[PDB]
Design an enzyme around this catalytic site. Structure first.
Site, PDB file in Angstrom:
ATOM      1  N   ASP A   1      18.556  43.655  -1.223  1.00  0.00           N
ATOM      2  CA  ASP A   1      17.998  43.340  -2.525  1.00  0.00           C
ATOM      3  C   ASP A   1      17.171  44.517  -3.044  1.00  0.00           C
ATOM      4  O   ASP A   1      16.877  45.462  -2.306  1.00  0.00           O
ATOM      5  CB  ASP A   1      17.151  42.061  -2.441  1.00  0.00           C
ATOM      6  CG  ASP A   1      16.034  42.159  -1.428  1.00  0.00           C
ATOM      7  OD1 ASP A   1      16.089  43.050  -0.555  1.00  0.00           O
ATOM      8  OD2 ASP A   1      15.102  41.327  -1.502  1.00  0.00           O
TER       9      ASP A   1
ATOM     10  N   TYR B   1      14.046  46.877  -4.244  1.00  0.00           N
ATOM     11  CA  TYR B   1      12.632  47.000  -3.925  1.00  0.00           C
ATOM     12  C   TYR B   1      11.846  46.017  -4.778  1.00  0.00           C
ATOM     13  O   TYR B   1      12.226  45.703  -5.910  1.00  0.00           O
ATOM     14  CB  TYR B   1      12.129  48.419  -4.183  1.00  0.00           C
ATOM     15  CG  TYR B   1      12.808  49.496  -3.383  1.00  0.00           C
ATOM     16  CD1 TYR B   1      12.780  49.483  -1.992  1.00  0.00           C
ATOM     17  CD2 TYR B   1      13.469  50.542  -4.021  1.00  0.00           C
ATOM     18  CE1 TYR B   1      13.407  50.478  -1.257  1.00  0.00           C
ATOM     19  CE2 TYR B   1      14.099  51.541  -3.300  1.00  0.00           C
ATOM     20  CZ  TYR B   1      14.063  51.507  -1.922  1.00  0.00           C
ATOM     21  OH  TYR B   1      14.686  52.505  -1.215  1.00  0.00           O
TER      22      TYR B   1
ATOM     23  N   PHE C   1      18.575  51.757  -3.077  1.00  0.00           N
ATOM     24  CA  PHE C   1      17.749  52.751  -2.392  1.00  0.00           C
ATOM     25  C   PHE C   1      17.084  53.761  -3.324  1.00  0.00           C
ATOM     26  O   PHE C   1      16.128  54.432  -2.921  1.00  0.00           O
ATOM     27  CB  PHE C   1      18.567  53.494  -1.327  1.00  0.00           C
ATOM     28  CG  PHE C   1      18.906  52.652  -0.134  1.00  0.00           C
ATOM     29  CD1 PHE C   1      17.912  52.213   0.725  1.00  0.00           C
ATOM     30  CD2 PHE C   1      20.218  52.300   0.129  1.00  0.00           C
ATOM     31  CE1 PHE C   1      18.218  51.434   1.824  1.00  0.00           C
ATOM     32  CE2 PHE C   1      20.533  51.519   1.226  1.00  0.00           C
ATOM     33  CZ  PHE C   1      19.533  51.086   2.074  1.00  0.00           C
TER      34      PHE C   1
ATOM     35  N   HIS D   1      20.436  49.719  10.236  1.00  0.00           N
ATOM     36  CA  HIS D   1      19.734  49.957   8.983  1.00  0.00           C
ATOM     37  C   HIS D   1      18.825  51.183   9.106  1.00  0.00           C
ATOM     38  O   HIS D   1      18.201  51.397  10.153  1.00  0.00           O
ATOM     39  CB  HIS D   1      18.906  48.729   8.610  1.00  0.00           C
ATOM     40  CG  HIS D   1      18.355  48.779   7.225  1.00  0.00           C
ATOM     41  ND1 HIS D   1      17.149  49.374   6.926  1.00  0.00           N
ATOM     42  CD2 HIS D   1      18.836  48.300   6.055  1.00  0.00           C
ATOM     43  CE1 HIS D   1      16.916  49.271   5.631  1.00  0.00           C
ATOM     44  NE2 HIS D   1      17.927  48.626   5.078  1.00  0.00           N
TER      45      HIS D   1
END
Length: 233
Positions: free
Chosen positions: A68, A70, A80, A190
């Site tokens: 999702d 920030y 990102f 991740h």
């Protein structure tokens, strides 16, 4: 009406949504517009489809999935990517550092705007496109899943020889949607430090070398490469 789908027309044409799916996306967008009247939601409404304005579907070389947005006001509509006014958060600092250690023409920039990636055909797609302020994962669920899954399948169905960078358990859960006979899939932990390593198993993000391997794959299929070192402020 196609105006209120917020998608660039070349994407609307490429996705070829049915009437049912266009109405379902319009209801979702209208539901979110009403949610903004009680709660702060990131990103802004006119950035939800920001990825579709930075390049056309035929330009896509690499698909990078986010989770999702920030949730502190720094989301831009790209996975990102960081608004130049905000600090680079732990996930992207970890991405830059893998790049710094593996790709010769990369120098870590002082900012986190990845618009230069998006123009070159790097699709930075969150798997869920909205988030409530200060509550990560608050819009995970079936509200966005049908829609971002539809996009990935359309890229796998209609394009050829792209690279899917799957980082983390949620992005890796989208593996069955990609035809691995037409596309390269690269999985890793991740990038946010000390993220899960499986439970059920995937390689470490540090040293995954995914950006070189993506370009090696595109070079072997005679496609242009991604210049990760190009990041304009």
């Amino acid at each position: 009406d196609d105006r209120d789908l917020l998608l660039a027309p070349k994407w609307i044409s490429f996705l070829s949504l049915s009437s049912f799916l266009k109405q379902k996306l319009l209801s979702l967008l209208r539901q979110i517009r009403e949610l903004r009247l009680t709660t702060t939601v990131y990103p802004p409404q006119d950035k939800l489809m920001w990825w579709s304005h930075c390049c056309d579907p035929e330009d896509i070389k690499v698909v990078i999935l986010g989770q999702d947005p920030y949730h502190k006001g720094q989301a831009t509509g790209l996975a990102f990517s960081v608004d130049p006014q905000c600090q680079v958060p732990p996930s992207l600092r970890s991405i830059f550092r893998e790049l710094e250690a593996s790709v010769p023409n990369f120098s870590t920039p002082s900012h986190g705007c990845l618009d230069s990636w998006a123009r070159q055909g790097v699709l930075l797609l969150n798997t869920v496109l909205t988030v409530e302020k200060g509550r990560a994962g608050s819009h995970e669920g079936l509200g966005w899943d049908w829609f971002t899954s539809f996009i990935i399948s359309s890229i796998s169905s209609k394009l050829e020889h792209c690279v899917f960078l799957l980082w983390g358990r949620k992005a890796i859960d989208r593996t069955p949607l990609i035809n691995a006979q037409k596309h390269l899939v690269l999985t890793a932990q991740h990038p946010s430090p000390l993220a899960s390593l499986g439970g059920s198993r995937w390689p470490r993000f540090q040293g995954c070398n995914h950006f070189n391997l993506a370009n090696d794959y595109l070079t072997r299929h005679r496609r242009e490469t991604v210049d990760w070192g190009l990041l304009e402020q």
